[PDB]
Amino acid sequence: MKEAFKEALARFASGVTVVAARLGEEERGMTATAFMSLSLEPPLVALAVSERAKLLPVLEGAGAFTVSLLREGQEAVSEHFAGRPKEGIALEEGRVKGALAVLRCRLHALYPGGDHRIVVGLVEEVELGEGGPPLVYFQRGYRRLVWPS
Amino acid sequence: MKEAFKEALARFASGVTVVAARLGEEERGMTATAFMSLSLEPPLVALAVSERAKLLPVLEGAGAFTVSLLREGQEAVSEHFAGRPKEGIALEEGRVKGALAVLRCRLHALYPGGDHRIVVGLVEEVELGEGGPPLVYFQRGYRRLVWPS
Structure with a gap:
């Protein structure tokens, strides 16, 4: 169903993130490409989280979460938190x-988003890793950017 | 201010879109990287539009808009609708x-988004161009995907 719509979305390239939340010792991570900057003042970002995602209840219960931007070569991490378990992740x-x-x-904030919930986060801390190319998703596959030395 | 936050966002790669709407005798286009799929049923997409964008009132009044996903080689289009006019665009x-x-x-639907407005569109029509690589933005510059792969 909705073949054309899905094809159009498969044509929007994007980085890949892992959204995570924890309540006590109960922690959940979920791979998401549906992430975007939202505001500078205040510093906000928005994400789409499935209404059926195990992450949602924990994120709501915690009232806080993290978003990790994956780099080139981290396909295993993306797959793991996408529901397809990987070793050592x-x-x-x-x-x-x-x-x-x-x-x-x-x-x-949390707003309606059809079969997903729009999750808005106020950024309180930022961690920057080493530079380098990103993990990209486009046309139903992990892609690499032209980033020569 | 917000140097680390801006750097983190610069590390999230994405395609580039042009959001447009028309009302009466006015029609405006605006470049946006803040776009993401939101829902399958109903078919929804979300975007962040600056609260001071000239496009916003037009889009609100029209109650409809379009989102064009730019392909590789359309940097001039992105620049033009981003506020840097290009001949013939x-x-x-x-x-x-x-x-x-x-x-x-x-x-x-529309929702508050700090200095931006969260705009949710229900997809009614899809137009697919001929297949090919996308225009990408990452680390404050236009990029290309290693394609095919």
């Missing part, structure tokens, strides 16, 4: 270690 | 001709 400090960047957010 | 049929895809949306 785990969150550290509530985020993905070695990511291009991590945004630690306070939950700012 | 203009919308055709309310969207960008030659784009990878065009989504004609009904304005579904």
